[PDB]
Amino acid sequence: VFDVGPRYTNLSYIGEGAYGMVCSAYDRVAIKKISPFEHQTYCQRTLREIKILLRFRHENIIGINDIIRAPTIEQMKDVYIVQDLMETDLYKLLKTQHLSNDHICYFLYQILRGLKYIHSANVLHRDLKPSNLLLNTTCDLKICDFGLARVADPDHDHTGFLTEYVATRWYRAPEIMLNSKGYTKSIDIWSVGCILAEMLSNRPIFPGKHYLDQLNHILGILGSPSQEDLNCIINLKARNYLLSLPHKNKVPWNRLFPNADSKALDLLDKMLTFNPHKRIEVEQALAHPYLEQYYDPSDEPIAEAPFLPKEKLKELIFEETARFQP
């Protein structure tokens, strides 16, 4: 059932996921059907997607063009979110094409330009990965899926060793497994570093097969953390775990990526820094020599200002979508 008229017609299936289903429709646009009201978690992800995307306006962030839902809270069971139609995503593109360096450079620039705007609003995306980067034939790139987004909260980032996490395994920073809830901007930079590595070789750089295996993959390439980085680890159990490991040397980036541009690998190194406090921030990344041909702070805008039971969340979703009613 895809009930979006009178405005949208001639539907065609694009894809499907845990969120629901997305189609293309003539206003052509993309339309996704969300049916989240039976569970608090799904309502939280829906309200985050909507509240954040309605408050953002940026060329490298997917917008929300329209939202269709019933005229009353009682009748509202589904929500249809209308967005600009794109042609593919970076996950699909990487299955069929090896990207030239100059495409990687331009795509990375756009990811970081959009991320600058997100981080300037004090928001964290928290699930950056190739499938959340939409592309078209003109090589425009848009960041999508803010369902796991949060307002940054560095003062409350601390958690225990081996604390469960929801965002996509392969793109998780090492500190998620050691001491962090993913409430600081550095979590997104790590994910971008993973995406860069993936564009350079068409394979995920750290394909952990399960939770702790993800840290095995990271330490297998970065090598053992330094004493100073262990001094920043916070948790007794994380310190003891890292101290218990045999010494592992760093695998050189030029051995993993022998055909990559040296400036791309220097930036990769800085995004894939073990210690989040030493990891490059988005504005620094934009200013890195690899991206020098595109860097222009005057054309990298920032946000105008920074940023419960399932029944209360439904009321909030109802209120947040009210502006699209005739």
Ligand SMILES: CS[C@@]1(C(=O)Nc2ccc3[nH]nc(-c4ccc(OC(C)C)nc4)c3c2)CCN(CC(=O)N2CC=C(c3ccc(-c4ncn(C)n4)cc3)CC2)C1
């Ligand atoms: C990246 S997928 C996404 C999206 O925005 N996709 C999108 C948006 C605009 C688009 N324009 N164009 C495309 C497109 C076009 C062609 C194409 O490829 C062709 C080759 C077919 N790929 C993409 C496109 C695709 C669809 C969903 N979006 C998030 C989104 O809508 N959110 C709201 C609700 C969320 C959610 C998550 C999970 C659950 C749930 N329920 C049960 N379970 C177990 N889990 C419930 C609710 C999460 C946040 C993200």
